[PDB]
Amino acid sequence: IDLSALNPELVQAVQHVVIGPSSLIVHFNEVIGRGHFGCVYHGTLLDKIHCAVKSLNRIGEVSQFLTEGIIMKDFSHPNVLSLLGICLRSEGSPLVVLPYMKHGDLRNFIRNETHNPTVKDLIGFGLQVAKGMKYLASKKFVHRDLAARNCMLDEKFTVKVADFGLARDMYDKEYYSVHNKTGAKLPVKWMALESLQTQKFTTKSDVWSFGVLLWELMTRGAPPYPDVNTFDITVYLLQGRRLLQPEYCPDPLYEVMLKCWHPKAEMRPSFSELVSRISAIFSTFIG
Ligand SMILES: COCCOc1cnc2ccc([C@H](C)n3nnc4ccn(-c5cc(C)ns5)c(=O)c43)cc2c1
């Protein structure tokens, strides 16, 4: 680490993000996650806390890497995945240390035959995601890749918006398509009309993605637009089409989704308004 290279004011924060090699025991033997940029393994962190250790070696400016960690550690919210820190290993790229999420990613959880979340439960997961996104949006942070696959659940079934900062990766390559002109691999079925056209992402395009995530929840993890092929989604939507109302999605919740998919970005609801609206719908259910 070169503390001279960093922003002078961020030098203090480094001792809080850096995890000493002796503090962390990473179990490389068993793999719990597969990403494009690297695998993730079981980890034991001295404090004994169970954690997930992500490799990034499958890096760039080290000063930039550390600052990314510092920003990420400053986030603290029950529905946002935290960063426990970064462990530097001599011989290999640095490791990202995240809290262990017992019940995997949200999409696989709702697709699990052995778990039977109620309609209320699924609306509840939707609310938690809206809450985490409200926090992140207030921090002027733009996720760019909000989807059910990219949220995770701890032992208490608490839903945390994940897959951002140093944890950012492609964890299911099927849903990422190569753009023609710029080669970027984009999650086109979660993307807002404008983002498909310009590749510019905003909080308002996160809101569109959140609409699709609500749909995944209500369909219990069904793939959006199966009958559609990659970048043909712009044409499909422009025909005047949206995802259909899932069988058990409450009418008010479908209206929420449609609002999230408003043609005008600025007319989509804020994450605050979504929290409000969804909490009300949630409150009408029992069980
Ligand atoms: C035995 O299965 C238990 C789940 O294993 C874990 C536990 N905690 C984790 C915490 C973070 C992560 C990595 C770094 N991560 N961070 N954000 C995300 C978002 C989605 N995903 C995944 C999505 C999918 C479809 N497979 S993995 C992540 O792995 C992830 C993986 C874990 C895997």
PDB file of C-alpha atoms and ligand atoms in Angstrom:
ATOM      1  CA  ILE A   1       0.000   0.000   0.000  1.00  0.00           C
ATOM      2  CA  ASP A   2       1.193   3.484  -0.962  1.00  0.00           C
ATOM      3  CA  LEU A   3      -0.537   5.953   1.390  1.00  0.00           C
ATOM      4  CA  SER A   4       1.096   8.777  -0.607  1.00  0.00           C
ATOM      5  CA  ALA A   5      -0.959   7.865  -3.692  1.00  0.00           C
ATOM      6  CA  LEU A   6      -4.352   8.019  -1.946  1.00  0.00           C
ATOM      7  CA  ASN A   7      -6.483  11.095  -1.303  1.00  0.00           C
ATOM      8  CA  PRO A   8      -4.901  12.601   1.876  1.00  0.00           C
ATOM      9  CA  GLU A   9      -8.223  12.523   3.765  1.00  0.00           C
ATOM     10  CA  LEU A  10      -8.909   8.840   3.021  1.00  0.00           C
ATOM     11  CA  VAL A  11      -5.587   7.628   4.497  1.00  0.00           C
ATOM     12  CA  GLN A  12      -7.148   7.267   7.976  1.00  0.00           C
ATOM     13  CA  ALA A  13      -9.948   5.018   6.645  1.00  0.00           C
ATOM     14  CA  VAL A  14      -7.489   2.462   5.213  1.00  0.00           C
ATOM     15  CA  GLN A  15      -6.706   0.864   8.600  1.00  0.00           C
ATOM     16  CA  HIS A  16     -10.441   0.137   8.937  1.00  0.00           C
ATOM     17  CA  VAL A  17     -10.858  -1.552   5.533  1.00  0.00           C
ATOM     18  CA  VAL A  18      -7.623  -3.586   5.503  1.00  0.00           C
ATOM     19  CA  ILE A  19      -7.750  -7.091   6.991  1.00  0.00           C
ATOM     20  CA  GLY A  20      -4.452  -8.606   8.162  1.00  0.00           C
ATOM     21  CA  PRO A  21      -3.432 -11.982   6.636  1.00  0.00           C
ATOM     22  CA  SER A  22      -3.413 -13.567  10.123  1.00  0.00           C
ATOM     23  CA  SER A  23      -7.002 -12.435  10.817  1.00  0.00           C
ATOM     24  CA  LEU A  24      -8.595 -14.331   7.911  1.00  0.00           C
ATOM     25  CA  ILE A  25      -8.731 -18.070   7.187  1.00  0.00           C
ATOM     26  CA  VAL A  26     -10.009 -18.607   3.638  1.00  0.00           C
ATOM     27  CA  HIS A  27     -11.165 -22.125   2.698  1.00  0.00           C
ATOM     28  CA  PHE A  28     -10.177 -22.467  -0.981  1.00  0.00           C
ATOM     29  CA  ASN A  29     -11.212 -26.156  -0.969  1.00  0.00           C
ATOM     30  CA  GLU A  30     -14.977 -25.553  -1.247  1.00  0.00           C
ATOM     31  CA  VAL A  31     -16.480 -23.070  -3.734  1.00  0.00           C
ATOM     32  CA  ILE A  32     -19.701 -21.216  -2.829  1.00  0.00           C
ATOM     33  CA  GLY A  33     -19.834 -18.774  -5.755  1.00  0.00           C
ATOM     34  CA  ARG A  34     -18.820 -18.543  -9.411  1.00  0.00           C
ATOM     35  CA  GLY A  35     -18.302 -15.165 -11.076  1.00  0.00           C
ATOM     36  CA  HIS A  36     -16.675 -13.940 -14.287  1.00  0.00           C
ATOM     37  CA  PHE A  37     -13.966 -12.029 -12.373  1.00  0.00           C
ATOM     38  CA  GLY A  38     -13.403 -14.802  -9.812  1.00  0.00           C
ATOM     39  CA  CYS A  39     -14.586 -17.495  -7.412  1.00  0.00           C
ATOM     40  CA  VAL A  40     -15.828 -16.966  -3.850  1.00  0.00           C
ATOM     41  CA  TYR A  41     -14.978 -19.264  -0.920  1.00  0.00           C
ATOM     42  CA  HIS A  42     -15.832 -19.964   2.743  1.00  0.00           C
ATOM     43  CA  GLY A  43     -13.915 -17.826   5.241  1.00  0.00           C
ATOM     44  CA  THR A  44     -13.256 -17.607   8.977  1.00  0.00           C
ATOM     45  CA  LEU A  45     -12.497 -14.127  10.324  1.00  0.00           C
ATOM     46  CA  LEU A  46     -10.978 -13.527  13.780  1.00  0.00           C
ATOM     47  CA  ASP A  47     -13.073 -11.108  15.855  1.00  0.00           C
ATOM     48  CA  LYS A  48     -15.114 -16.165  15.030  1.00  0.00           C
ATOM     49  CA  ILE A  49     -17.338 -14.859  12.233  1.00  0.00           C
ATOM     50  CA  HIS A  50     -18.310 -16.765   9.108  1.00  0.00           C
ATOM     51  CA  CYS A  51     -17.661 -14.793   5.907  1.00  0.00           C
ATOM     52  CA  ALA A  52     -17.434 -15.076   2.117  1.00  0.00           C
ATOM     53  CA  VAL A  53     -14.094 -14.406   0.458  1.00  0.00           C
ATOM     54  CA  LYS A  54     -14.141 -13.358  -3.196  1.00  0.00           C
ATOM     55  CA  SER A  55     -11.151 -13.626  -5.532  1.00  0.00           C
ATOM     56  CA  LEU A  56     -10.742 -11.045  -8.321  1.00  0.00           C
ATOM     57  CA  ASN A  57      -7.862 -12.636 -10.216  1.00  0.00           C
ATOM     58  CA  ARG A  58      -9.739 -14.307 -13.104  1.00  0.00           C
ATOM     59  CA  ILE A  59      -6.958  -5.364 -10.868  1.00  0.00           C
ATOM     60  CA  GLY A  60      -5.966  -1.841 -11.973  1.00  0.00           C
ATOM     61  CA  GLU A  61      -4.773   1.086  -9.849  1.00  0.00           C
ATOM     62  CA  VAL A  62      -4.324  -0.131  -6.256  1.00  0.00           C
ATOM     63  CA  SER A  63      -5.107   3.384  -4.934  1.00  0.00           C
ATOM     64  CA  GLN A  64      -8.410   3.233  -6.854  1.00  0.00           C
ATOM     65  CA  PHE A  65      -9.144  -0.280  -5.573  1.00  0.00           C
ATOM     66  CA  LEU A  66      -8.696   0.823  -1.948  1.00  0.00           C
ATOM     67  CA  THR A  67     -10.861   3.941  -2.351  1.00  0.00           C
ATOM     68  CA  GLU A  68     -13.591   1.760  -3.849  1.00  0.00           C
ATOM     69  CA  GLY A  69     -13.344  -0.316  -0.652  1.00  0.00           C
ATOM     70  CA  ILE A  70     -13.487   2.803   1.546  1.00  0.00           C
ATOM     71  CA  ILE A  71     -16.664   4.119  -0.149  1.00  0.00           C
ATOM     72  CA  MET A  72     -18.212   0.643   0.054  1.00  0.00           C
ATOM     73  CA  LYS A  73     -17.461   0.288   3.780  1.00  0.00           C
ATOM     74  CA  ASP A  74     -19.105   3.666   4.509  1.00  0.00           C
ATOM     75  CA  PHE A  75     -22.463   2.171   3.473  1.00  0.00           C
ATOM     76  CA  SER A  76     -24.387   0.673   6.389  1.00  0.00           C
ATOM     77  CA  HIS A  77     -27.985  -0.485   5.999  1.00  0.00           C
ATOM     78  CA  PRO A  78     -29.884  -3.713   6.894  1.00  0.00           C
ATOM     79  CA  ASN A  79     -30.824  -4.286   3.241  1.00  0.00           C
ATOM     80  CA  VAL A  80     -27.439  -3.469   1.697  1.00  0.00           C
ATOM     81  CA  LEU A  81     -24.628  -6.049   1.625  1.00  0.00           C
ATOM     82  CA  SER A  82     -21.707  -4.744   3.694  1.00  0.00           C
ATOM     83  CA  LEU A  83     -17.970  -4.959   3.129  1.00  0.00           C
ATOM     84  CA  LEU A  84     -16.061  -6.450   6.064  1.00  0.00           C
ATOM     85  CA  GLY A  85     -12.789  -5.513   4.395  1.00  0.00           C
ATOM     86  CA  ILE A  86      -9.935  -6.407   2.061  1.00  0.00           C
ATOM     87  CA  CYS A  87      -7.148  -8.914   2.718  1.00  0.00           C
ATOM     88  CA  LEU A  88      -3.860  -8.468   0.837  1.00  0.00           C
ATOM     89  CA  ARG A  89      -1.996 -11.633  -0.182  1.00  0.00           C
ATOM     90  CA  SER A  90       1.627 -11.474  -1.392  1.00  0.00           C
ATOM     91  CA  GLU A  91       1.533 -13.582  -4.586  1.00  0.00           C
ATOM     92  CA  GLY A  92      -1.949 -13.000  -6.048  1.00  0.00           C
ATOM     93  CA  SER A  93      -4.584 -10.249  -6.247  1.00  0.00           C
ATOM     94  CA  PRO A  94      -6.311  -8.937  -3.069  1.00  0.00           C
ATOM     95  CA  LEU A  95      -9.343 -10.739  -1.617  1.00  0.00           C
ATOM     96  CA  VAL A  96     -12.746  -9.155  -0.974  1.00  0.00           C
ATOM     97  CA  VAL A  97     -14.320 -10.055   2.381  1.00  0.00           C
ATOM     98  CA  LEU A  98     -18.117 -10.060   2.708  1.00  0.00           C
ATOM     99  CA  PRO A  99     -20.543 -11.290   5.377  1.00  0.00           C
ATOM    100  CA  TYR A 100     -21.696 -14.869   4.805  1.00  0.00           C
ATOM    101  CA  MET A 101     -25.199 -15.051   3.320  1.00  0.00           C
ATOM    102  CA  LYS A 102     -26.666 -18.419   4.329  1.00  0.00           C
ATOM    103  CA  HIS A 103     -29.571 -18.635   1.874  1.00  0.00           C
ATOM    104  CA  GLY A 104     -27.796 -17.626  -1.341  1.00  0.00           C
ATOM    105  CA  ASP A 105     -29.136 -15.266  -3.984  1.00  0.00           C
ATOM    106  CA  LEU A 106     -32.776 -14.124  -3.918  1.00  0.00           C
ATOM    107  CA  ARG A 107     -33.679 -15.627  -7.311  1.00  0.00           C
ATOM    108  CA  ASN A 108     -32.535 -19.147  -6.476  1.00  0.00           C
ATOM    109  CA  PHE A 109     -34.255 -18.879  -3.078  1.00  0.00           C
ATOM    110  CA  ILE A 110     -37.684 -18.134  -4.604  1.00  0.00           C
ATOM    111  CA  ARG A 111     -37.021 -20.885  -7.184  1.00  0.00           C
ATOM    112  CA  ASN A 112     -36.323 -23.391  -4.387  1.00  0.00           C
ATOM    113  CA  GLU A 113     -38.933 -26.174  -4.149  1.00  0.00           C
ATOM    114  CA  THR A 114     -38.239 -26.797  -0.440  1.00  0.00           C
ATOM    115  CA  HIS A 115     -38.971 -23.186   0.555  1.00  0.00           C
ATOM    116  CA  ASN A 116     -42.539 -21.911   0.245  1.00  0.00           C
ATOM    117  CA  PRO A 117     -42.667 -18.128   0.773  1.00  0.00           C
ATOM    118  CA  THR A 118     -46.202 -16.718   0.893  1.00  0.00           C
ATOM    119  CA  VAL A 119     -47.361 -13.896  -1.402  1.00  0.00           C
ATOM    120  CA  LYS A 120     -46.867 -11.586   1.598  1.00  0.00           C
ATOM    121  CA  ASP A 121     -43.313 -12.977   2.073  1.00  0.00           C
ATOM    122  CA  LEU A 122     -42.457 -12.202  -1.578  1.00  0.00           C
ATOM    123  CA  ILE A 123     -43.906  -8.701  -1.345  1.00  0.00           C
ATOM    124  CA  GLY A 124     -41.810  -8.443   1.842  1.00  0.00           C
ATOM    125  CA  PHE A 125     -38.595  -9.342  -0.003  1.00  0.00           C
ATOM    126  CA  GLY A 126     -39.610  -6.644  -2.542  1.00  0.00           C
ATOM    127  CA  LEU A 127     -39.982  -4.093   0.265  1.00  0.00           C
ATOM    128  CA  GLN A 128     -36.550  -4.889   1.739  1.00  0.00           C
ATOM    129  CA  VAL A 129     -34.941  -4.418  -1.688  1.00  0.00           C
ATOM    130  CA  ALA A 130     -36.755  -1.090  -2.095  1.00  0.00           C
ATOM    131  CA  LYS A 131     -35.389  -0.126   1.335  1.00  0.00           C
ATOM    132  CA  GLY A 132     -31.785  -1.030   0.451  1.00  0.00           C
ATOM    133  CA  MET A 133     -32.107   0.783  -2.861  1.00  0.00           C
ATOM    134  CA  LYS A 134     -33.573   3.842  -1.108  1.00  0.00           C
ATOM    135  CA  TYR A 135     -30.429   3.980   1.054  1.00  0.00           C
ATOM    136  CA  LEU A 136     -28.104   3.544  -1.967  1.00  0.00           C
ATOM    137  CA  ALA A 137     -29.989   6.117  -4.046  1.00  0.00           C
ATOM    138  CA  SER A 138     -29.684   8.593  -1.133  1.00  0.00           C
ATOM    139  CA  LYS A 139     -25.901   8.039  -1.259  1.00  0.00           C
ATOM    140  CA  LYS A 140     -26.119   9.101  -4.939  1.00  0.00           C
ATOM    141  CA  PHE A 141     -25.062   5.528  -5.788  1.00  0.00           C
ATOM    142  CA  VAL A 142     -26.310   3.870  -8.981  1.00  0.00           C
ATOM    143  CA  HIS A 143     -26.345   0.051  -8.965  1.00  0.00           C
ATOM    144  CA  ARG A 144     -26.638  -0.506 -12.759  1.00  0.00           C
ATOM    145  CA  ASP A 145     -27.334  -4.235 -12.288  1.00  0.00           C
ATOM    146  CA  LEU A 146     -30.281  -4.633  -9.876  1.00  0.00           C
ATOM    147  CA  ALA A 147     -31.879  -8.088 -10.298  1.00  0.00           C
ATOM    148  CA  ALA A 148     -33.091 -10.958  -8.060  1.00  0.00           C
ATOM    149  CA  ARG A 149     -29.902 -12.930  -8.835  1.00  0.00           C
ATOM    150  CA  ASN A 150     -27.963  -9.972  -7.427  1.00  0.00           C
ATOM    151  CA  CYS A 151     -29.661  -9.751  -4.025  1.00  0.00           C
ATOM    152  CA  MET A 152     -28.782 -12.155  -1.212  1.00  0.00           C
ATOM    153  CA  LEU A 153     -30.363 -13.565   1.972  1.00  0.00           C
ATOM    154  CA  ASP A 154     -28.734 -14.098   5.370  1.00  0.00           C
ATOM    155  CA  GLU A 155     -29.706 -16.707   8.034  1.00  0.00           C
ATOM    156  CA  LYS A 156     -32.605 -14.480   9.110  1.00  0.00           C
ATOM    157  CA  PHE A 157     -33.985 -14.274   5.537  1.00  0.00           C
ATOM    158  CA  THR A 158     -33.053 -10.569   5.500  1.00  0.00           C
ATOM    159  CA  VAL A 159     -32.649  -9.437   1.886  1.00  0.00           C
ATOM    160  CA  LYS A 160     -29.549  -7.428   1.039  1.00  0.00           C
ATOM    161  CA  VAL A 161     -28.909  -5.606  -2.217  1.00  0.00           C
ATOM    162  CA  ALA A 162     -25.569  -7.064  -3.280  1.00  0.00           C
ATOM    163  CA  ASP A 163     -23.362  -7.265  -6.377  1.00  0.00           C
ATOM    164  CA  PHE A 164     -21.933  -3.737  -6.223  1.00  0.00           C
ATOM    165  CA  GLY A 165     -18.545  -2.074  -5.618  1.00  0.00           C
ATOM    166  CA  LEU A 166     -15.847  -4.726  -5.115  1.00  0.00           C
ATOM    167  CA  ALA A 167     -18.498  -7.482  -5.063  1.00  0.00           C
ATOM    168  CA  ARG A 168     -19.656  -6.543  -8.593  1.00  0.00           C
ATOM    169  CA  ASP A 169     -19.529  -9.430 -11.076  1.00  0.00           C
ATOM    170  CA  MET A 170     -21.511 -11.465 -13.580  1.00  0.00           C
ATOM    171  CA  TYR A 171     -22.847 -14.330 -11.459  1.00  0.00           C
ATOM    172  CA  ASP A 172     -25.141 -15.813 -14.130  1.00  0.00           C
ATOM    173  CA  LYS A 173     -23.580 -15.180 -17.559  1.00  0.00           C
ATOM    174  CA  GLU A 174     -26.788 -16.213 -19.370  1.00  0.00           C
ATOM    175  CA  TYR A 175     -28.442 -12.840 -18.727  1.00  0.00           C
ATOM    176  CA  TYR A 176     -25.635 -10.635 -20.079  1.00  0.00           C
ATOM    177  CA  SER A 177     -25.381  -9.722 -23.770  1.00  0.00           C
ATOM    178  CA  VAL A 178     -22.508  -8.190 -25.739  1.00  0.00           C
ATOM    179  CA  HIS A 179     -23.319  -4.784 -27.222  1.00  0.00           C
ATOM    180  CA  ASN A 180     -22.471  -4.375 -30.933  1.00  0.00           C
ATOM    181  CA  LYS A 181     -20.606  -1.050 -30.925  1.00  0.00           C
ATOM    182  CA  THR A 182     -18.891  -1.058 -27.503  1.00  0.00           C
ATOM    183  CA  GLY A 183     -18.610  -4.745 -26.506  1.00  0.00           C
ATOM    184  CA  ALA A 184     -19.989  -4.149 -22.984  1.00  0.00           C
ATOM    185  CA  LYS A 185     -21.898  -7.089 -21.483  1.00  0.00           C
ATOM    186  CA  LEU A 186     -25.291  -5.704 -20.488  1.00  0.00           C
ATOM    187  CA  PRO A 187     -28.237  -7.216 -18.534  1.00  0.00           C
ATOM    188  CA  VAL A 188     -30.642  -6.103 -21.271  1.00  0.00           C
ATOM    189  CA  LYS A 189     -33.877  -7.617 -19.829  1.00  0.00           C
ATOM    190  CA  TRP A 190     -33.475  -5.557 -16.640  1.00  0.00           C
ATOM    191  CA  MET A 191     -32.569  -2.376 -18.479  1.00  0.00           C
ATOM    192  CA  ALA A 192     -34.626   0.751 -19.101  1.00  0.00           C
ATOM    193  CA  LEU A 193     -35.445   1.776 -22.672  1.00  0.00           C
ATOM    194  CA  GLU A 194     -33.023   4.733 -22.470  1.00  0.00           C
ATOM    195  CA  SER A 195     -30.158   2.623 -21.072  1.00  0.00           C
ATOM    196  CA  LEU A 196     -30.558   0.174 -23.955  1.00  0.00           C
ATOM    197  CA  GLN A 197     -30.191   3.108 -26.346  1.00  0.00           C
ATOM    198  CA  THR A 198     -27.377   5.089 -24.665  1.00  0.00           C
ATOM    199  CA  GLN A 199     -25.806   2.697 -22.101  1.00  0.00           C
ATOM    200  CA  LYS A 200     -26.193   5.503 -19.545  1.00  0.00           C
ATOM    201  CA  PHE A 201     -27.499   4.303 -16.168  1.00  0.00           C
ATOM    202  CA  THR A 202     -29.305   6.381 -13.508  1.00  0.00           C
ATOM    203  CA  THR A 203     -31.223   5.868 -10.257  1.00  0.00           C
ATOM    204  CA  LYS A 204     -34.330   6.052 -12.485  1.00  0.00           C
ATOM    205  CA  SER A 205     -33.000   3.097 -14.527  1.00  0.00           C
ATOM    206  CA  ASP A 206     -32.401   1.218 -11.249  1.00  0.00           C
ATOM    207  CA  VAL A 207     -36.149   1.840 -10.656  1.00  0.00           C
ATOM    208  CA  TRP A 208     -36.975   0.139 -13.990  1.00  0.00           C
ATOM    209  CA  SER A 209     -34.769  -2.814 -12.910  1.00  0.00           C
ATOM    210  CA  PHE A 210     -36.630  -2.875  -9.602  1.00  0.00           C
ATOM    211  CA  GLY A 211     -39.921  -3.247 -11.476  1.00  0.00           C
ATOM    212  CA  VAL A 212     -38.531  -6.377 -13.176  1.00  0.00           C
ATOM    213  CA  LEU A 213     -37.234  -7.690  -9.837  1.00  0.00           C
ATOM    214  CA  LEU A 214     -40.767  -7.301  -8.381  1.00  0.00           C
ATOM    215  CA  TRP A 215     -41.965  -9.424 -11.326  1.00  0.00           C
ATOM    216  CA  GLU A 216     -39.319 -12.112 -10.637  1.00  0.00           C
ATOM    217  CA  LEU A 217     -40.545 -12.224  -7.035  1.00  0.00           C
ATOM    218  CA  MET A 218     -44.207 -12.631  -7.978  1.00  0.00           C
ATOM    219  CA  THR A 219     -43.402 -15.282 -10.610  1.00  0.00           C
ATOM    220  CA  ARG A 220     -41.108 -17.017  -8.083  1.00  0.00           C
ATOM    221  CA  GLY A 221     -37.972 -16.618 -10.205  1.00  0.00           C
ATOM    222  CA  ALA A 222     -39.281 -17.019 -13.766  1.00  0.00           C
ATOM    223  CA  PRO A 223     -37.119 -15.653 -16.591  1.00  0.00           C
ATOM    224  CA  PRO A 224     -38.397 -12.328 -17.964  1.00  0.00           C
ATOM    225  CA  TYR A 225     -39.252 -12.239 -21.695  1.00  0.00           C
ATOM    226  CA  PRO A 226     -38.260 -15.831 -22.546  1.00  0.00           C
ATOM    227  CA  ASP A 227     -39.830 -15.541 -26.036  1.00  0.00           C
ATOM    228  CA  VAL A 228     -37.484 -12.594 -26.707  1.00  0.00           C
ATOM    229  CA  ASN A 229     -33.876 -12.675 -27.941  1.00  0.00           C
ATOM    230  CA  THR A 230     -31.269 -10.304 -26.403  1.00  0.00           C
ATOM    231  CA  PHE A 231     -31.206  -6.797 -27.973  1.00  0.00           C
ATOM    232  CA  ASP A 232     -34.542  -7.376 -29.760  1.00  0.00           C
ATOM    233  CA  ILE A 233     -35.985  -6.229 -26.386  1.00  0.00           C
ATOM    234  CA  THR A 234     -35.924  -2.563 -27.481  1.00  0.00           C
ATOM    235  CA  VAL A 235     -38.264  -3.371 -30.412  1.00  0.00           C
ATOM    236  CA  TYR A 236     -40.487  -5.616 -28.231  1.00  0.00           C
ATOM    237  CA  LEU A 237     -40.964  -2.879 -25.607  1.00  0.00           C
ATOM    238  CA  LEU A 238     -41.493  -0.208 -28.273  1.00  0.00           C
ATOM    239  CA  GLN A 239     -44.373  -2.269 -29.715  1.00  0.00           C
ATOM    240  CA  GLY A 240     -46.126  -1.116 -26.506  1.00  0.00           C
ATOM    241  CA  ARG A 241     -45.401  -4.164 -24.379  1.00  0.00           C
ATOM    242  CA  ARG A 242     -44.589  -4.803 -20.734  1.00  0.00           C
ATOM    243  CA  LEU A 243     -44.222  -7.958 -18.612  1.00  0.00           C
ATOM    244  CA  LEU A 244     -47.625  -9.495 -17.795  1.00  0.00           C
ATOM    245  CA  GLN A 245     -49.298  -9.542 -14.372  1.00  0.00           C
ATOM    246  CA  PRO A 246     -48.201 -12.710 -12.522  1.00  0.00           C
ATOM    247  CA  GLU A 247     -51.080 -14.865 -11.238  1.00  0.00           C
ATOM    248  CA  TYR A 248     -50.665 -13.908  -7.580  1.00  0.00           C
ATOM    249  CA  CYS A 249     -49.407 -10.329  -8.022  1.00  0.00           C
ATOM    250  CA  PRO A 250     -51.895  -7.913  -6.368  1.00  0.00           C
ATOM    251  CA  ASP A 251     -53.397  -5.367  -8.799  1.00  0.00           C
ATOM    252  CA  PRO A 252     -51.859  -2.459  -6.842  1.00  0.00           C
ATOM    253  CA  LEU A 253     -48.427  -4.131  -7.086  1.00  0.00           C
ATOM    254  CA  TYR A 254     -48.755  -4.562 -10.869  1.00  0.00           C
ATOM    255  CA  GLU A 255     -49.561  -0.820 -11.067  1.00  0.00           C
ATOM    256  CA  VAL A 256     -46.308  -0.232  -9.132  1.00  0.00           C
ATOM    257  CA  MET A 257     -44.371  -2.290 -11.715  1.00  0.00           C
ATOM    258  CA  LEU A 258     -45.938  -0.337 -14.590  1.00  0.00           C
ATOM    259  CA  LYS A 259     -44.903   2.916 -12.898  1.00  0.00           C
ATOM    260  CA  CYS A 260     -41.354   1.547 -12.589  1.00  0.00           C
ATOM    261  CA  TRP A 261     -41.467   0.911 -16.354  1.00  0.00           C
ATOM    262  CA  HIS A 262     -42.715   4.399 -17.296  1.00  0.00           C
ATOM    263  CA  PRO A 263     -41.356   5.519 -20.717  1.00  0.00           C
ATOM    264  CA  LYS A 264     -40.210   8.822 -19.143  1.00  0.00           C
ATOM    265  CA  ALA A 265     -37.378   8.173 -16.666  1.00  0.00           C
ATOM    266  CA  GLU A 266     -38.187  11.226 -14.529  1.00  0.00           C
ATOM    267  CA  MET A 267     -41.829  10.066 -14.200  1.00  0.00           C
ATOM    268  CA  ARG A 268     -40.875   6.744 -12.556  1.00  0.00           C
ATOM    269  CA  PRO A 269     -41.353   6.669  -8.754  1.00  0.00           C
ATOM    270  CA  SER A 270     -38.429   7.333  -6.420  1.00  0.00           C
ATOM    271  CA  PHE A 271     -37.265   4.466  -4.215  1.00  0.00           C
ATOM    272  CA  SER A 272     -38.781   6.364  -1.272  1.00  0.00           C
ATOM    273  CA  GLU A 273     -42.224   6.371  -2.972  1.00  0.00           C
ATOM    274  CA  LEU A 274     -41.798   2.646  -3.742  1.00  0.00           C
ATOM    275  CA  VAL A 275     -41.027   1.930  -0.066  1.00  0.00           C
ATOM    276  CA  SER A 276     -44.185   3.842   0.841  1.00  0.00           C
ATOM    277  CA  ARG A 277     -46.480   2.178  -1.750  1.00  0.00           C
ATOM    278  CA  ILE A 278     -45.163  -1.352  -1.183  1.00  0.00           C
ATOM    279  CA  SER A 279     -45.364  -1.101   2.634  1.00  0.00           C
ATOM    280  CA  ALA A 280     -49.083  -0.243   2.269  1.00  0.00           C
ATOM    281  CA  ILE A 281     -49.789  -3.196  -0.070  1.00  0.00           C
ATOM    282  CA  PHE A 282     -47.722  -5.419   2.257  1.00  0.00           C
ATOM    283  CA  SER A 283     -49.808  -4.307   5.272  1.00  0.00           C
ATOM    284  CA  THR A 284     -53.052  -5.572   3.675  1.00  0.00           C
ATOM    285  CA  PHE A 285     -51.904  -9.229   3.762  1.00  0.00           C
ATOM    286  CA  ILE A 286     -51.948 -11.856   6.523  1.00  0.00           C
ATOM    287  CA  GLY A 287     -49.622 -14.891   6.695  1.00  0.00           C
TER     288      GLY A 287
HETATM  289  C1  LIG B   1     -23.907 -22.654   0.238  1.00  0.00           C
HETATM  290  O1  LIG B   1     -24.461 -21.477  -0.374  1.00  0.00           O
HETATM  291  C2  LIG B   1     -24.412 -20.382   0.548  1.00  0.00           C
HETATM  292  C3  LIG B   1     -24.149 -19.106  -0.226  1.00  0.00           C
HETATM  293  O2  LIG B   1     -22.726 -18.856  -0.261  1.00  0.00           O
HETATM  294  C4  LIG B   1     -22.463 -17.521  -0.203  1.00  0.00           C
HETATM  295  C5  LIG B   1     -22.606 -16.803   0.984  1.00  0.00           C
HETATM  296  N1  LIG B   1     -22.347 -15.501   1.031  1.00  0.00           N
HETATM  297  C6  LIG B   1     -21.932 -14.831  -0.057  1.00  0.00           C
HETATM  298  C7  LIG B   1     -21.668 -13.466   0.023  1.00  0.00           C
HETATM  299  C8  LIG B   1     -21.241 -12.778  -1.112  1.00  0.00           C
HETATM  300  C9  LIG B   1     -21.067 -13.457  -2.321  1.00  0.00           C
HETATM  301  C10 LIG B   1     -20.612 -12.727  -3.591  1.00  0.00           C
HETATM  302  C11 LIG B   1     -19.325 -11.923  -3.361  1.00  0.00           C
HETATM  303  N2  LIG B   1     -21.730 -11.867  -4.038  1.00  0.00           N
HETATM  304  N3  LIG B   1     -21.874 -10.670  -3.751  1.00  0.00           N
HETATM  305  N4  LIG B   1     -22.905 -10.206  -4.265  1.00  0.00           N
HETATM  306  C12 LIG B   1     -23.528 -11.169  -4.952  1.00  0.00           C
HETATM  307  C13 LIG B   1     -24.698 -11.223  -5.712  1.00  0.00           C
HETATM  308  C14 LIG B   1     -25.069 -12.424  -6.318  1.00  0.00           C
HETATM  309  N5  LIG B   1     -24.274 -13.582  -6.169  1.00  0.00           N
HETATM  310  C15 LIG B   1     -24.640 -14.789  -6.798  1.00  0.00           C
HETATM  311  C16 LIG B   1     -25.670 -14.961  -7.630  1.00  0.00           C
HETATM  312  C17 LIG B   1     -25.765 -16.220  -8.100  1.00  0.00           C
HETATM  313  C18 LIG B   1     -26.881 -16.635  -9.061  1.00  0.00           C
HETATM  314  N6  LIG B   1     -24.837 -17.094  -7.683  1.00  0.00           N
HETATM  315  S1  LIG B   1     -23.835 -16.267  -6.683  1.00  0.00           S
HETATM  316  C19 LIG B   1     -23.088 -13.502  -5.403  1.00  0.00           C
HETATM  317  O3  LIG B   1     -22.378 -14.494  -5.258  1.00  0.00           O
HETATM  318  C20 LIG B   1     -22.736 -12.291  -4.800  1.00  0.00           C
HETATM  319  C21 LIG B   1     -21.336 -14.820  -2.399  1.00  0.00           C
HETATM  320  C22 LIG B   1     -21.765 -15.501  -1.269  1.00  0.00           C
HETATM  321  C23 LIG B   1     -22.028 -16.861  -1.346  1.00  0.00           C
END
